[PDB]
Structure 1
Amino acid sequence: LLADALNAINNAEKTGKRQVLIRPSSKVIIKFLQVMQKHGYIGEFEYIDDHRSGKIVVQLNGRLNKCGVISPRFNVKIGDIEKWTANLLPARQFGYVILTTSAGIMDHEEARRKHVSGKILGFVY
C-alpha cells in the first residue's frame, strides 16, 4: 500500500500521462499532494464516487523526477532532517522530504518553521 503508491504516479510522469488514474480512500492520503500543489509539482485534483472506498483524480504537468517512499518510517528531529535529505534527494535546493510531523502532515522546511519533529513518509524531487 505504501510501496506501490508513489511508484504509480512517478511512472505516469515518466511516460507522460496527463492525468494519472489512482483510487483508495479511508483516513493517510491527499494533503501532502496539496503541499505538492503549493510547490507546483502537481496541479488540481477532485474526488469521484465508487461502490466501495472512493476514486481520486490527479492532474499532472510533467514535474516529478523521482518520488518514492521511506519504507521504515524513521524518527526525524528538528536538526537532523538533512542527514536524510542528503541521501533521499540527490539534489539540494530541488525537492523536499515530506515529514509526518506532530502538526499534521506537511513539508520538512515548514516543519523547521513550526519547530516540530515526527516521522517520515516519502521524498519528492
Structure 2
Amino acid sequence: TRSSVLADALNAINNAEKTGKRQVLIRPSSKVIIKFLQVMQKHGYIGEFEYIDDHRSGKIVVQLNGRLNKCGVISPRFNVKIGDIEKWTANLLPARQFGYVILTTSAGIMDHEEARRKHVSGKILGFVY
C-alpha cells in the first residue's frame, strides 16, 4: 500500500525531470509535500505548482523549469541531532557549497542551512540538489 505519499511525489518529480516534461501531476497531496515543494521552490529548483482541490485528498500540478538534478526522500525519518546534520550533508550531497538536505524540526520544515542558522534540529525528511 501507499506507505509514503511524499516518496511517491518525489519519485514522480524525479521521473518527470529525467524524462523531460514541463508539468507533472502528483496524487495525493499533503501538508508535508506542500512544504517540501515550497522549500525546493524557494531555491529555484522547481517552478510553480498549484493544488487541485477535489474533496477527497487533493492533487498537485507542478511546473518544472529544468535545473533540478535529483530530489529524494530518506526513509525512515531518522532522529538527527544537530552535531550530526553536517555528516548527513557529507553523506549525500555533491559538494559543500550547493545541495540542500531537508529537516522536519520543531520550527517547521526547512533546509539544513536554515536549521543551523536557527540552531535547531529534528528529524530528517529528504534531500534535493
1:79 Cα offset (Å): 2.2
CA contact (8 A) 1:32 1:107 kept: no
Normalising by the residue count of structure 1, what TM-score does the alignment of the two structures yield? 0.90
Following superposition, the deviation at residue 92 of structure 1 comes to 2.6
Deviations 1:89-114 (A, max 9, x none): 13332210000011011111101111
For structure 2, the 5+ residue unaligned runs are none
Question: CA separation of 1:33/1:52 partners in 2, compared to 1, >3 Å: closer, same or farther?
Answer: same
Q: Is the 8 A contact 1:2 1:71 kept in 2?
A: no
Q: Is the contact made by 1:13 and 1:63 (CA closer than 8 Å) also made in structure 2? A: no
What secondary structure sits across from 1:62 in the alignment?
coil
Paired residues of 1:6 and 1:69 also in contact (CA < 8 A): yes
- What is the CA-CA distance between 1:55 and the residue it aligns to? 1.5
Offset at residue 120 of structure 1 (A): 0.6
SS at match of 1:25: coil
Coordinate RMSD, CA, aligned: 1.6
TM-score, normalization by structure 2: 0.87
Deviates more, 1:17-26 or 1:107-116: 17-26
Aligned partners of 1:59 and 1:77: how far apart in 2?
34
> How many angstroms does 1:61 deviate by?
0.6
**Counterparts in 2 of 1:2 and 1:31: CA distance versus 1, 3 Å:** closer
Distance 1:26 1:59 in 2: 18
For residues 64 and 4 of structure 1, what CA distance do their matches in structure 2 show?
17
The answer to whether the 8 A contact 2:9-2:27 is kept is: no
Task: Among all aligned residue pairs of Structure 1 and Structure 2, give the percentage whose two residues are the same amino acid.
Answer: 99
What 5-or-longer segments of structure 1 have no aligned partner?
none
- Check conservation: 1:25, 1:55, Cα contact below 8 A: yes
User: Take 2:103 and 2:47, find their aligned partners in 1: how far apart are those partners?
Assistant: 21
Higher helix share: 2
* C-alpha contact (below 8 Å) 2:6/2:32 kept by paired residues: no
Q: CA deviation at 1:26?
A: 4.6
CA contact (8 A) 2:101 2:128 kept: yes
Q: Deviations over 1:43-79 (max 9, x none)?
A: 1111223252112111101122111111121122222
Give the distance between the partners of 2:34 and 2:47, measured in 1 at CA.
Answer: 12
